[PDB]
């Protein structure tokens, strides 16, 4: 019975029942792990066994974090998180650090356990039920449910928000320069000090936390070659926008003229100052493609002029914290990927290009997920919200291995799209 504190009531969105999602196949490695980490959770009684009588459910799986080589159970509370929301976004929304993005180095702490010390609403517990698969279906599923604030449920951080604002009050008044943000199972801490000092100031925050019960994971730095642990920090600077650029030929074949007409045309939706007539006239009648064309002084006039318009921020863009967030990813090729984050169509809020982690193993799947994650992370920092993802892949495939390469406390909402290479709109050169 972990805490005296009075349990706060949670009532899902009206006219919507709890989550009833099925449990996907899990590989031994993950089961074995999931079992153990669950058992010892039942003992201390953070969780409770339950049977068929509970008609709800949610899926779980676990990921052996490379961050610390320690498994982490993961519950896909997306449905539930959705089903309950006057709660966290309205009633008790956690404000955003305008400047968290403006810091030079920012690290993330998995303040997950901080939750296992708050009783979860008496009634609202049936909803968090989950199950554990059995290899070859040797035996039925082992079901459980939460008794304390669960990890990865939009509600937790909101509920705990109070006991957390306090825990940080000191550390913040004795380190005003630092900025701290919490998004679900995480703590975004960012500083302006040398990386060496930051590294420390973080490892110092870790203590202030432990001096309060909040045990944070133990990250490992290896002395062998790829010093991956060197990336742990985030840097909101190598975060450059990715504008579109029009090619540069010396002699423009017919073919080459159209391409540029299309792009210039599409982009017209983004920025309205794109004219094509005076530049498309050059193609007036049914001619071969391979046919060279002399750019008119009236043509090359606006070509190099239109491009002048493709080097700045869009037509007065605004981010409305009340609307959702969308992100698109297009497999550019040879490990490169691109993305745009927008709330409204053609009013992109950010465009960029996730290059590649040398550990891509020539695996688009693996790469894509990483791109999702990466992109996601940026969003939390920048606007403090997760975007819905239009995933350039076939569900059946993505559903088969997105977990294997996944490494996050949270999970973003996604959908699938088979939209071919419209135009090299989002530039590859």
């Amino acid at each position, epitope marked *: 019975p972990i805490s005296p504190i009075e349990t706060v009531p949670v009532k899902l969105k009206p006219g919507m029942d709890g989550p009833k999602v099925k449990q996907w196949p899990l590989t031994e490695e993950k089961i074995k792990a999931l079992v153990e980490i669950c058992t010892e959770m039942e003992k201390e009684g953070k969780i409770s066994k339950i049977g068929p009588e509970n008609p709800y459910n949610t899926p779980v799986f676990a990921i052996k974090k490379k961050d610390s080589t320690k498994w982490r159970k993961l519950v896909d509370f997306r449905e539930l998180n959705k089903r309950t929301q006057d709660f966290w976004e309205v009633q008790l929304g956690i404000p955003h650090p305008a400047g968290l993005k403006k810091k030079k180095s920012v690290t993330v702490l998995d303040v997950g356990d901080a939750y296992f010390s708050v009783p979860l609403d008496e009634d609202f517990r049936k909803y968090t039920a989950f199950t554990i698969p059995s290899i070859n279906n040797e035996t039925p599923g082992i079901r459980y449910q939460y008794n304390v604030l669960p990890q990865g449920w939009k509600g937790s951080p909101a509920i705990f928000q109070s006991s957390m604002t306090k825990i940080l009050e000191p550390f913040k008044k004795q380190n005003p320069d630092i900025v701290i943000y919490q998004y679900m199972d995480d703590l975004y801490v960012g500083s302006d000090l040398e*990386i*060496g000092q930051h*590294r*420390t100031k973080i490892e110092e925050l870790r203590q202030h936390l432990l001096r309060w019960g909040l045990t944070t994971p133990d990250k490992k*730095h290896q*002395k*062998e*070659p*790829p*010093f991956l642990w060197m990336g742990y920090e985030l840097h909101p600077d190598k975060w450059t926008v990715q504008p579109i650029v029009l090619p540069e030929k010396d002699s423009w074949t017919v073919n080459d003229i159209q391409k540029l007409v299309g792009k210039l045309n599409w982009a017209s939706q983004i920025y309205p100052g794109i004219k094509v007539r005076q530049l498309s006239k050059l193609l007036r009648g049914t001619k071969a493609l391979t046919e060279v064309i002399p750019l008119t002084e009236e043509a090359e006039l606006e070509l190099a002029e239109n491009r002048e318009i493709l080097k700045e921020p869009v037509h007065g863009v605004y981010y409305d914290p009340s609307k959702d967030l969308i992100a698109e990813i297009q497999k550019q090729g040879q490990g490169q990927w691109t993305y745009q984050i927008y709330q409204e169509p053609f009013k992109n809020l950010k465009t960029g290009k996730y290059a590649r982690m040398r550990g891509a193993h020539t695996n688009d799947v693996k790469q894509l997920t990483e791109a999702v994650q990466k992109i996601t992370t940026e969003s939390i920092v920048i606007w403090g919200k997760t975007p819905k993802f239009k995933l350039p892949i076939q569900k059946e495939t993505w559903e088969t291995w997105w977990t294997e390469y996944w490494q996050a406390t949270w999970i973003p909402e996604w959908e699938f799209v088979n939209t071919p290479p419209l135009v090299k709109l989002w530039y590859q050169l």
Partner: antibody, heavy 123, light 108 residues
């Protein structure tokens, strides 16, 4: 402004221990990447790696002499030590303690060296 | 116990020259090699780290390269200091290791 100076007994009797001291300045053994390494160099032969002490104390030893080696520090005094048990004539050499540091995801090198101490085993 | 080898032991050249020394490994060390300069005095300095990156405050006439198992250092055009012993260190996997050094002398 970074410097290291090996300290020692320069001469030890066979089968006795000796404890080298690396007094440095210009960097702390607390800052993330940093560490101190101990290179050896017999009279005339080439360079050898003895051991490297890291800030997290995840020290590594030359497999050939782990049984006779032992590294340590005193972060506050900026010193780093290296102890060798049961020495033999073959251990007579010049010992260097160099400031090792992991800079990035790919670079890790012995950026600054000391002048070394001349330890010689002889009854 | 990754054996690092420098076949070229004693190599003599002359001022103005241009030289290249070879440091082989025992297994793909993915460009995790460093280059050290030990003057006759005895001091040891850092020339190159990560097989091709120059250490601050080092003559631009210095460059080395390699990949997988073969790596080599090339001193642009000799000066009177350059004439010294050279070592390459493999840090792809502890235990760390150095070559057998390459003594760079002067032709007379």
């Amino acid at each position: 402004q970074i410097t290291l100076k090996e300290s020692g007994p320069g001469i030890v009797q066979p089968s006795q221990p000796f404890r080298l001291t690396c007094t440095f300045s210009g960097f702390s053994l607390s800052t993330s990447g940093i560490g101190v390494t101990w290179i050896r160099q017999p009279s005339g032969k080439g360079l050898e790696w003895l051991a490297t002490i890291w800030w997290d104390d995840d020290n590594r030893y030359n497999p050939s002499l782990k049984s006779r080696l032992t590294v340590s520090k005193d972060t506050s005094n900026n010193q780093a030590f290296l102890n060798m048990m049961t020495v033999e004539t073959a251990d007579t050499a010049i010992y260097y303690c160099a400031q090792s540091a992991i800079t990035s995801v790919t670079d890790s090198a012995m950026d600054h060296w000391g002048q070394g101490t001349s330890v010689t085993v002889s009854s | 116990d990754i054996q690092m080898t420098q076949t070229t032991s004693s190599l003599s050249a002359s001022l103005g020259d241009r030289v290249t020394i070879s440091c082989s490994a025992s297994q793909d060390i993915s460009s995790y090699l460093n280059w050290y300069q030990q003057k006759p005095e005895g001091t040891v300095k850092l020339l190159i780290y990560y097989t091709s990156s120059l250490h601050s405050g080092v003559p631009s006439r210095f460059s080395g390269s390699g990949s997988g198992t073969d790596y080599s250092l090339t001193i642009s055009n000799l000066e009177p200091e350059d004439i010294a012993t050279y070592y390459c260190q493999q840090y792809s996997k502890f235990p760390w290791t150095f070559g057998g050094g390459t003594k760079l002398e002067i032709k007379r």
